[PDB]
Amino acid sequence: MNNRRKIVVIGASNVGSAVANKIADFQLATEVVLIDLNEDKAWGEAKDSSHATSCIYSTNIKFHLGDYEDCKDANIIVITAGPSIRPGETPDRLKLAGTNAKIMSSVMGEIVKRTKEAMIIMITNPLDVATYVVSTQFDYPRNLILGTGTMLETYRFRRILADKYQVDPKNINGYVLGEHGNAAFVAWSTTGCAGFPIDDLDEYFHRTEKLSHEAVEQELVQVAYDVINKKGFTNTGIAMAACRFIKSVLYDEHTILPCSAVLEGEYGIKDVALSIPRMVCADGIMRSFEVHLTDDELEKMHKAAQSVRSALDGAGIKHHHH
Amino acid sequence: MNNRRKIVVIGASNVGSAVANKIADFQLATEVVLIDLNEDKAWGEAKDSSHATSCIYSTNIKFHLGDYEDCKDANIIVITAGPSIRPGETPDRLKLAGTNAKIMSSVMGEIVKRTKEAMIIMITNPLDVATYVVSTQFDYPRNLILGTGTMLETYRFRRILADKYQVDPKNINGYVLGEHGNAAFVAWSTTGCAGFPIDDLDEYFHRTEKLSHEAVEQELVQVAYDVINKKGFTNTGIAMAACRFIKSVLYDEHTILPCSAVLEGEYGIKDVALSIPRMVCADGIMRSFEVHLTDDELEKMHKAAQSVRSALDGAGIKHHHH
Amino acid sequence: MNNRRKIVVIGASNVGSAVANKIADFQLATEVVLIDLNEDKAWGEAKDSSHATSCIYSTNIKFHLGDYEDCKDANIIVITAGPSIRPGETPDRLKLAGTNAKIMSSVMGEIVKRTKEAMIIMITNPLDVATYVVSTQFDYPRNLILGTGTMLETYRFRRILADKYQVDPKNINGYVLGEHGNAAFVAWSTTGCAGFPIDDLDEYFHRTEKLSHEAVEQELVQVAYDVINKKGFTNTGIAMAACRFIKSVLYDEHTILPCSAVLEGEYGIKDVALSIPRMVCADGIMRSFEVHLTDDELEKMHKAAQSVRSALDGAGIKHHHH
Amino acid sequence: MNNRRKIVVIGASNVGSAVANKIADFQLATEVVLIDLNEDKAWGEAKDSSHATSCIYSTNIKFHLGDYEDCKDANIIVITAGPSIRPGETPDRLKLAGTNAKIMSSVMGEIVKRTKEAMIIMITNPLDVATYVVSTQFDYPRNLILGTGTMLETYRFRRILADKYQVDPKNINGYVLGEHGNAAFVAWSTTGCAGFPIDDLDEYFHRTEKLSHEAVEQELVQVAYDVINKKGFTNTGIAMAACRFIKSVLYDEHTILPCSAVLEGEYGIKDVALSIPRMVCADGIMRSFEVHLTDDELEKMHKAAQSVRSALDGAGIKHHHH
Ligand SMILES: NC(=O)c1ccc[n+]([C@@H]2O[C@H](COP(=O)([O-])OP(=O)(O)OC[C@H]3O[C@@H](n4cnc5c(N)ncnc54)[C@H](O)[C@@H]3O)[C@@H](O)[C@H]2O)c1
Ligand SMILES: NC(=O)c1ccc[n+]([C@@H]2O[C@H](COP(=O)([O-])OP(=O)(O)OC[C@H]3O[C@@H](n4cnc5c(N)ncnc54)[C@H](O)[C@@H]3O)[C@@H](O)[C@H]2O)c1
Ligand SMILES: NC(=O)c1ccc[n+]([C@@H]2O[C@H](COP(=O)([O-])OP(=O)(O)OC[C@H]3O[C@@H](n4cnc5c(N)ncnc54)[C@H](O)[C@@H]3O)[C@@H](O)[C@H]2O)c1
Ligand SMILES: NC(=O)c1ccc[n+]([C@@H]2O[C@H](COP(=O)([O-])OP(=O)(O)OC[C@H]3O[C@@H](n4cnc5c(N)ncnc54)[C@H](O)[C@@H]3O)[C@@H](O)[C@H]2O)c1
Incomplete structure (x- = not known):
């Protein structure tokens, strides 16, 4: 061997x-x-x-x-x-x-x-x-x-809330899903901080100004462009995401992670790649976990599906079927 | 310096x-x-x-x-x-x-x-x-x-569900709280697996026999005694918990973790040590996070408080006050 | 794969x-x-x-x-x-x-x-x-x-000189060879500290009492028995040596290390296992490096060969040949 | 604290x-x-x-x-x-x-x-x-x-011999000293491979073409310029050297390493920085180890001293004294 x-x-x-x-x-x-x-x-x-x-x-x-x-x-x-x-x-x-x-x-x-x-x-x-x-x-x-998909947006989500409340980013649970791009969204339905709702942090820390979900979702998207404009490119956070998937594969971890693959009917979507929760192990993606999205989150997944499928079409990549 | x-x-x-x-x-x-x-x-x-x-x-x-x-x-x-x-x-x-x-x-x-x-x-x-x-x-x-408290029970909780469903234990969120002992309990209200309810895993994996919360909570308690009986003692999992706290301190992480300290009125309890969620950083415990327990979880916290306070009393350790 | x-x-x-x-x-x-x-x-x-x-x-x-x-x-x-x-x-x-x-x-x-x-x-x-x-x-x-052989004695050699002179043990080069036992010896001909002779450390540190080679070789042997007597057993240093060989194998390192295997004519010795310098890689031991021993070092290798072969004979293990 | x-x-x-x-x-x-x-x-x-x-x-x-x-x-x-x-x-x-x-x-x-x-x-x-x-x-x-000085040239020395003979670079002992530059030289007097002379590797591996010391010393210098020309710059090997010194400081290791500091009379040289062997610990450089250079190595140290001192003079940096 x-x-x-x-x-x-x-x-x-x-x-x-x-x-x-x-x-x-x-x-x-x-x-x-x-x-x-x-x-x-x-x-x-x-x-x-x-x-x-x-x-x-x-x-x-x-x-x-x-x-x-x-x-x-x-x-x-x-x-x-x-x-x-x-x-x-x-x-x-x-x-x-x-x-x-x-x-x-x-x-x-x-x-x-x-x-x-x-x-x-x-x-x-x-x-x-x-x-x-x-x-x-x-x-x-x-x-x-x-x-790698929205693993990197998910690190960004964790850091924003970590920096806002001075909490460990590892305490920030849940996912950014959809496109690695402008149709990334926070699946708030999947989230928490250390076993309680992210919206409760304002109460624990006696903040007068309340967390804006829209502000967090726009920041985690916009920060990629700010880094490209100010550094010239990005590489550190993506290298880290790459290594995280490598470890799920080499340690046969069975980790459920946001990553991009062709959808096969989850959320009514097929024949497009987006990030949804998927188990990663020595044999790669074993399966998806179709978490129950709110109506608003489902709408964002569909918008992401539509935007990527339209970019594939614009680049002359065909629709495919079984 | x-x-x-x-x-x-x-x-x-x-x-x-x-x-x-x-x-x-x-x-x-x-x-x-x-x-x-x-x-x-x-x-x-x-x-x-x-x-x-x-x-x-x-x-x-x-x-x-x-x-x-x-x-x-x-x-x-x-x-x-x-x-x-x-x-x-x-x-x-x-x-x-x-x-x-x-x-x-x-x-x-x-x-x-x-x-x-x-x-x-x-x-x-x-x-x-x-x-x-x-x-x-x-x-x-x-x-x-x-x-270290119920950090070790919390690792045990993660491993039991990791082994049951072939999922990464790191996907298992939430805490075992209370006594490092027979009055440890799972705060199910704080839990999840990879951004969805732990009770949904049976559906994702098409299991006919449904998860028993009581079975999980008894296993994570009983396994400590089985290891003591079969190995003679325990040391590996506790050494790991010790290192986890050391890292929260030396990397000033601000991690919210289950750990034992004297309660100061959380859940109506004072002048006893139990594990509740606490932020750990370079200066040690900065504060607690009094997560909202169900009536049943609150009852278990009180039972734990009563059991430890009675053991302190039996050992001739005084009540203390401010 | x-x-x-x-x-x-x-x-x-x-x-x-x-x-x-x-x-x-x-x-x-x-x-x-x-x-x-x-x-x-x-x-x-x-x-x-x-x-x-x-x-x-x-x-x-x-x-x-x-x-x-x-x-x-x-x-x-x-x-x-x-x-x-x-x-x-x-x-x-x-x-x-x-x-x-x-x-x-x-x-x-x-x-x-x-x-x-x-x-x-x-x-x-x-x-x-x-x-x-x-x-x-x-x-x-x-x-x-x-x-693992005299890898562990070699760690002991490094620590003794590290502790004596307050130098990094990683600066201590060379090998303890022969038996993992009383016929272990320091191959002084193979040694150095950070690119200079170990005997020169006394001059660099202005020590009046000169290093005793015999004292170092007896200490690195005797310390195993002192640890067994005082701790009850040894396990930490050997676990570390085990991991060092594992890494040479899994990283296909081609590291030359002291380790035990049946000799095939090196130093005139065959049909006994002792530690001599050997290259370790993904396919295990690729070969030996028969370093040129002084007459005294060669005598110690022969004494080690004789002592192990006599223990094999006493245990009813046959001589073998090609 | x-x-x-x-x-x-x-x-x-x-x-x-x-x-x-x-x-x-x-x-x-x-x-x-x-x-x-x-x-x-x-x-x-x-x-x-x-x-x-x-x-x-x-x-x-x-x-x-x-x-x-x-x-x-x-x-x-x-x-x-x-x-x-x-x-x-x-x-x-x-x-x-x-x-x-x-x-x-x-x-x-x-x-x-x-x-x-x-x-x-x-x-x-x-x-x-x-x-x-x-x-x-x-x-x-x-x-x-x-x-960092000739720590990086020393990694280069190790890799060249590691690649030439398919041996672990960690087996390559000794130093490249002098200028981090064209007056870097191999202190062959300080070197070995796994406890034997580097010149013996040709015999162990039955090589007909014999190692050229001059070829090795020129390669380890020239490779920096080839990487700059082909990659545009260098950063990986130097980042690694930086981390190696950081670890000697934070683990108070007392490691003897090639690093640059103002010489105070070693090799007859003062009031210039070059790399010579120095012990690094929590308090930084504790001292130098003035290893005994051959006449040719001493000449190269003097040439390095002269070249750096002339560059300092050309940049309008004064001579200094005690
Ligand atoms: N998924 C993420 O989160 C994430 C993050 C950062 C960057 N990226 C993407 O990674 C890619 C690389 O980024 P970069 O900054 O290194 O880009 P870059 O333009 O600096 O470098 C791209 C490299 O690809 C090479 N290349 C081009 N065509 C090739 C081919 N056919 N075969 C082999 N090599 C080829 C080029 O020579 C060049 O060296 C970009 O598409 C970037 O947008 C993704
Ligand atoms: N919190 C946890 O999750 C967890 C897990 C495992 C064990 N433990 C506890 O850790 C403790 C140690 O376990 P162990 O298996 O090593 O026990 P052990 O009985 O094998 O060893 C206890 C050691 O303490 C030493 N000691 C006793 N009194 C001392 C004193 N006054 N000063 C210094 N040393 C003293 C003894 O000489 C002995 O070496 C026990 O109380 C055990 O129950 C806690
Ligand atoms: N090479 C070294 O440097 C080094 C260092 C330390 C110890 N050792 C050796 O390692 C060995 C283990 O040391 P220890 O302290 O763990 O010993 P130990 O006596 O505490 O334990 C030995 C274990 O082997 C098990 N065992 C016995 N026969 C077995 C068989 N046929 N199949 C499977 N398991 C079997 C026993 O049940 C026991 O659990 C000893 O021989 C010791 O001398 C070597
Ligand atoms: N010692 C070694 O082994 C080794 C190896 C590689 C590079 N280097 C040296 O490291 C240096 C950096 O290399 P690089 O490729 O990053 O260079 P670079 O030119 O790409 O970047 C240098 C950076 O320094 C910044 N800077 C300039 N003046 C400054 C000041 N006064 N205060 C703060 N920042 C200032 C610039 O804005 C720029 O971002 C160079 O001198 C290079 O030769 C040394």
Whole structure:
């Protein structure tokens, strides 16, 4: 049998290199391979990482430039290839659908020649679009494809309430669901803080100004664009989300998490990827948990479904069926 | 200023040595000191640990036998001294009140000569009794005393439901509150699984036999006695709980957790220690969160209050007031 | 392919439970199985551990009582079964050869029915004896058997010099080789401190009393017996050594380490297990590095060879050949 | 006393953000503060990090934009401010002396108004130049200033030999000393691999082509420029070195490491910063270890001394004396 764990990261720019380096920090692989059209960048990133993994406190993690033959024995393949939205551009990841759908077809085209067994973690934007393209255009075990999705919005939700009330973000339970994008929404019906309603924190802390649900949901969406405008891009929080899914897979955790995959009738929605609660384990997504949404939350899920499906259509990605 | 973190563990037997070794594994201290009436055991435990901390992947953590002068510059002092209930004995930690109240007075008597600044983590049984004795018989900043309490029952709650439904225990939210003992209870009003009711898991997993709340609450209590009878003692889960509180303190996390401290009027209860939800940070317990208990849960909190207060009375520990 | 890592620990007493808990702390497995003749102890240890792995900072590591069918898909099997030398007894692990050789035959007898692919880490004493028995009495890939050996004496060497000079033990390079026992010796020819001779530390620190090589070598041997006499047993340092080998295997590190295996002509020695420098990787021991010993060091290796071979003979274990 | 650990990172670009994120991954602080002339970047980096530290496996590490008032209670201050050498430019960090000496004076000027107690880790290039400027132009406890120096070249040395022979880089002992720059050299006199000479690896591995010391020393220097040319910059290996020093300080390890500080007569050199072996602990640099260099190694140390002192002179930094 094989004691080694091999992870391939496609795209070795800001996101790929942050995912690769978090993997190295948390010692989640034996071997990390970087693939990029720009092989010089992939080589430089891998070389810089190979020096970090020579530290006395690091395991000897093998970093290198590679190619698609490295997908043959990959446990996990994280896809980060393709451009982002840039500072001052329209704050809408769905504008990337046309270009990035084509990159995802090209990249998944090469992967499936080498493997039908690697767990695929999608990060490339538009996240739900990219997750849809690789899930529907190729024969690949559906369980082995996961988009990070609204895991990152969910971290943002936790931090906003953590910062507002000076509470541990880990105490903030529940999910941001829907699109990794402007149709993300807080499923307030799923939420709590340390075993009590989030709306009760104002009473516990004697706040005169009451929490605005709309303010929290807009902040967690808008902060992604503020970071892109001020830092130039984002990579830290997404690298962390990537590692969280990697751990659910490698520790066969059976964790229920918000992540993106093609819906199969949940909330009356099919043939679109969005984030809904799904169990993640060594064999990838075992199933969804169709939590009971309020009428308003259900409306937001439908709006998200409509917005992603329209972006897929605009990029010339077909409807699919069984 | 001081870059070093010094933790003193009082009692170097099964529990103290497990707490000390978890601290070393998670690298939560610069220096770990063991204190025991049996200095030979404390020395042997510290020597065995000093070899582990010579591993290439360990920080150089200084383990040694020490004495109460090591409390002067201690960040944290974990109290594990005194006997447990033994296999085949009456499954009631409160039987330890008379003997262990006296040990706690002796041990806290020595600590307060050297420091008024160390975070004290109580583990010695009866946990609520021991936490009460050190909180009321000495002038010590009240914020700097925490009993692990029903944090351990809460891990047990998570594992039982994790094992029953094959879900991540981290998805199991809410608390076991009251006594670390036979008057522990599940505050079902505080609970969930991954943003939905625990009672809904039977539907998601199409189980014909429905979850019994009473069965879960009895199992999480009874399993402590089964482990004592079959292993001889417990130490792993409590060492883990100890480390969880240490991290809330050292990372100033502001985590809301079940832990034992003297109640100050919550649920109509005062002048007894029980576990209720409390925020833990660098300065110890900042405050409680008096979550709204059902009438049945409130009755169980009162029963727990009555049982611990009667054990304190039976051990000749006075009522105290402001 | 399989994202999961399964480790079986045979013997769930002081050593097995410490190895299992270090594995859980460092998150080195998906699943940890305990096997013991005393299934009650194995069950209790696994239950106590299952509560620790429900902590928010733990991966969902599955602990359970198991049986030899758990060896079928085991990545690693750590053998800790059988008695130790007890306080006040003759300080000679070789006295265990007769009893523990039989246990090792019984245990390895059951393993080889289920697997020819698990990495076997031997810990049971006499370590070199036990490592020899499982290596020679069964057809098993020789590369997949490693005794922890003088890795633990080497940690002891580092700590003694670390404590003497107030230097990081990680700066102490070189090996204790030979028997895990009274014929352990320091291969001074292999040693250094931070890139200079260990004998130069007295000059750097202006010490009037000069380091005694014999004093260091006797201390690192004698301290094992002092810990057994004062603590009752040892487990922490060996659990750490076990985890160090596990990491060399799971991270395919290619680390050169002192570990026990049957010699194949190194130093003129064959058909006995002792610790010599060996490279450890995902496929276990790839090879030895026959470092050039001084005449005195070579004499000590031969004395160790003679002492272990005589203990094997006394326990009725045959000579073997190719 | 204070349970919290606060680290300030000055410069929030590629290097500062990698140092900050490694600190967060290894949980080396309670609070990480970013300072930059570009406060938008510092804010964006801190916000992206604040989302990562909302993961269930992260401690609640507080990231924020800050200012020099955050230096008042800083345990550690890592200085990364100022430009690097850019792709296609002259491969000579010493060309940065004139500009970056002025930035270091400005930055250290502000720090010393708020603290005389923070451990200062210098990273800004020219590393030895920057380390010299902050050590000599201000009254600051000399023990509290360390440049990462040839720790990073030493990781590079380990990786080159690790990759060449398929051995663990942690087995590669000894140091690259002198300038973090073109006058870096391998102190071969200090080296080994797993307790034997590095030159013996060719024999162990039956290599026909013999190791070239000059080839290894040029590769470990040249690879920094290749990474800058191909990746655009470096940050991963330096972030790792930064964390290694942080751990020697916070775990009071007493580790002997190559790091940059003003020499006080070692090798006949004074009033210049270079990397020589130095012990690092909670109080910073306790002392140097003047290892006995060969005549050729001593010549290289003198060449390094001359090259850095000439760059300091060219940037208008004075000679200093006692
Ligand atoms: N899901 C999330 O939460 C999240 C967060 C951040 C970024 N992202 C997305 O991640 C992607 C990467 O972000 P970035 O900042 O690193 O982008 P970037 O534009 O800086 O880099 C993209 C990289 O992909 C490479 N690439 C392009 N086409 C390729 C192909 N066919 N094969 C291999 N490599 C190819 C490019 O050479 C480049 O190195 C973007 O789509 C971004 O929007 C997602
Ligand atoms: N709170 C929890 O969840 C939890 C869990 C497990 C055990 N415990 C409690 O932890 C305690 C320790 O358990 P154990 O199994 O290690 O017990 P043990 O009886 O094996 O060891 C107790 C140790 O305390 C030492 N000691 C006694 N009086 C002392 C004094 N005055 N000063 C210093 N040392 C002293 C003894 O010498 C002995 O080494 C017990 O009270 C047990 O019930 C609590
Ligand atoms: N190599 C080292 O550095 C090192 C260090 C410490 C201990 N040890 C050795 O480890 C072994 C265990 O030490 P301990 O303190 O845990 O011993 P122990 O006597 O406390 O426990 C041994 C356990 O093995 C079990 N066992 C016995 N025969 C068995 C069988 N056939 N199958 C399964 N389980 C069986 C027993 O029931 C018991 O639980 C001893 O031989 C000891 O000397 C080695
Ligand atoms: N020692 C090493 O091994 C090593 C390795 C890599 C880089 N470096 C050095 O680290 C430095 C940073 O590298 P980089 O790639 O991040 O550079 P960069 O040019 O991308 O960023 C430098 C940052 O410093 C900020 N800055 C400039 N002057 C400042 C001031 N007075 N106060 C506060 N912030 C200020 C800038 O706004 C910018 O954000 C360079 O000098 C580089 O050569 C050292």
